[PDB]
């Protein structure tokens, strides 16, 4: 066959800073949505890339709202 196109076990890559291995069911087979979020000092707002929906932004807002209750 040649070269393994994919990692044998996913437990071998690395822990990453802004990586969260999501879960989803794409009608072409399940796959993990590697949602990547980067924090940059500045004005303070939500930059919304990667073709979010309304609900996706609301989920981000909900996560920030909970994280604001407990920050320290």
């Amino acid at each position: 066959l040649g070269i393994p196109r994919y990692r044998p076990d996913k437990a071998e890559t690395e822990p990453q800073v802004g990586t969260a291995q999501g879960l989803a069911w794409t009608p072409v087979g399940g796959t993990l949505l590697t949602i990547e979020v980067a924090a940059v000092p500045g004005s303070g707002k939500l930059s919304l890339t990667g073709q979010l929906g309304e609900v996706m932004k609301e989920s981000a807002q909900a996560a920030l709202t909970y994280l604001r209750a407990h920050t320290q």
Binding site: E54, E58, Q61, A62, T65, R68
Partner: protein, 72 residues
């Protein structure tokens, strides 16, 4: 009356969330819903579910009538 601090219009934010983006029923048909929700979340005391609510709020503290009592 509800154990609240003297100043809570400035001292604390209020991130409000509603499961329906638009008006499911036109006008605030759940004014006292938010009254109860905000009172519970600002006095840090729970809100009794299994007892639904509905109405409208006026700034004097009066529950104005609502249409479609049958549907509520």
């Amino acid at each position: 009356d509800y154990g609240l601090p003297e100043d809570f219009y400035n001292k604390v934010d209020l991130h409000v969330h509603v499961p329906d983006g638009a008006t499911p029923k036109d006008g605030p048909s759940a004014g006292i819903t938010m009254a109860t929700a905000i009172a519970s979340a600002l006095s840090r005391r729970p809100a009794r579910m299994d007892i639904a609510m509905t109405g409208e709020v006026s700034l004097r503290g009066k529950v104005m009538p609502i249409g479609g009592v049958k549907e509520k």
